[PDB]
């Protein structure tokens, strides 16, 4: 799901995209401030958007949800996961652990508003 008056790849921008990094409880919220829910998980990417929309590009692979626009990170990249420790919104507190690993990303043409990239991503499905 995604904020109904924003784009996937906005949405994605906004939970996966943090080249300058921070802490969880801090970049937490603005997630959270969207759906007025504490999420459980969430990890950040810590490189530039370009460099994540460059692996639209790779040879595409199957996503867990079984479309075929899941594309693997060329290289590992320093990340944050942020799991949920306590609270209810707007309380939300998180642990991080630090991590350096393959991402695998779903993209898709931009739709109305999104930049003019031939692709752009939608959805982490995963990491490595
Ligand atoms: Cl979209
Ligand atoms: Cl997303
Ligand atoms: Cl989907
Ligand atoms: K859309
Ligand atoms: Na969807
Ligand atoms: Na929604
Ligand atoms: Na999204």
């Known amino acids: 799901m995604w904020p109904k008056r924003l784009t996937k790849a906005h949405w994605f921008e906004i939970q996966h995209i943090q080249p300058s990094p921070l802490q969880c409880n801090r970049a937490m919220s603005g997630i959270n401030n969207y759906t007025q829910h504490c999420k459980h998980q969430n990890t950040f ?4 958007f370009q460099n994540v929309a460059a692996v639209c590009d790779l040879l595409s692979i199957v996503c867990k949800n079984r479309r075929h626009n899941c ?4 290289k590992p990249v320093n990340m944050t996961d942020c799991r949920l420790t306590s609270g209810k919104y707007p309380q939300c507190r998180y642990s991080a652990a630090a991590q350096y690993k393959f991402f695998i990303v779903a993209c898709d043409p931009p739709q109305k508003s999104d930049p003019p990239y031939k692709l752009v991503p939608v959805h982490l499905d995963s990491i490595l």
Do not use: K, V
């Not at 990417?45 to 530039?48: G, Q, V």
């Not at 594309?71 to 060329?74: A, E, I, K, R």
């Open 71 to 74: 594309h693997q990170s060329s």
């Open 45 to 48: 990417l810590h490189d530039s």
